[PDB]
Chain A
Amino acid sequence: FHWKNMTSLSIEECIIPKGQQLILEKES
């Protein structure tokens, strides 16, 4: 598959929303 990230990449896309970060942090 031709992925978007292999042509363009921005800081927006790298930021994990605070709520989703909390889910990952707890399950760790």
Chain B
Amino acid sequence: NEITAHVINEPASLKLTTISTILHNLLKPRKHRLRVQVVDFWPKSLTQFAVLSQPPSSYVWMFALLVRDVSNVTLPVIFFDSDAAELINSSKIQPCNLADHPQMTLQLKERLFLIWGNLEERIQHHISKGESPTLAAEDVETPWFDIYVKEYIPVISLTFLQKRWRGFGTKIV
């Protein structure tokens, strides 16, 4: 599990735990560190990686990476707004209507290639073939990198299904 030179993390004192530990004494906000591989993502079109926040045309980054740890368990990690900008780490790649920006979409693809390798290609391959996108993960080797996540419960009883995780302090280089 040798991490890519292509992903740098912010200076932090958090130590390495596992996704198994995260899921298995109260439910307050937590801050974890993981050594991880991307196994899936949402949404399936990179064209939809930025959404409209404020009309008429103000967009923000919003997507999720399904990540997998040494302990063979997955976690959906949300990259939103400034944290997603941190990851993308590119002046020329900005939130907008991506369908209207083919060149920038290609640039996004190329940048995200550095964190998930041929995952996107394979996911799209399966969609066109009429097969499940989850097949893609086992087709390819995706790179390893350290990731920071902030655990929290947004306002949408109160169970674990109600927790969300958000990536941060992680940049593609």
**In the complex where A14-B78, A23-B28, A24-B29 touch, is A6 in contact with B154 (Cβ < 8 A)?**
no
Residue of B63, B64, B152 touching A17 (CB-CB under 8 A):
B152
**What secondary structure prevails in chain B residues at the interface with A?**
strand
Residue of B29, B150, B154 touching A15 (CB-CB under 8 A):
B154
Q: Are A13 and B78 in contact (CB under 8 A)?
A: yes
Residue of B40, B60, B75, B154 touching A12 (CB-CB under 8 A):
B154
The distance in angstroms between the C-alpha atoms of A13 and B164, with both chains bound, is 7
Q: Which residues of A contact B152 (CB under 8 A)?
A: 16-17, 20, 24
The distance in angstroms between the C-alpha atoms of A9 and B49, with both chains bound, is 11
Give the number of chain A interface residues (Cβ < 8 Å).
Answer: 19
Q: In angstroms, how far is the closest chain B Cβ from the Cβ of A27?
A: 7
Interface string of B17-59 (1 = CB under 8 A from A): 0000000000011010000000010110000000101000000
Give the number of chain B interface residues (Cβ < 8 Å).
Answer: 30
Interface check B93, CB cutoff 8 A: no
Interface string of A2-28 (1 = CB under 8 A from B): 011111010111111100100110011
A sample of 29 inter-chain contacts (CB < 8 A) reads A1-B73, A4-B76, A4-B161, A5-B164, A6-B40, A6-B76, A7-B42, A9-B43, A9-B62, A9-B63, A11-B51, A11-B53, A11-B62, A12-B156, A13-B154, A13-B156, A14-B62, A14-B78, A14-B80, A14-B81, A14-B154, A14-B164, A16-B152, A16-B154, A16-B166, A17-B153, A20-B152, A24-B29, A28-B12
Return the 8 tightest CB-CB contacts between A and B, nearest first: A5-B76, A14-B80, A20-B29, A3-B76, A5-B64, A16-B152, A23-B29, A20-B152
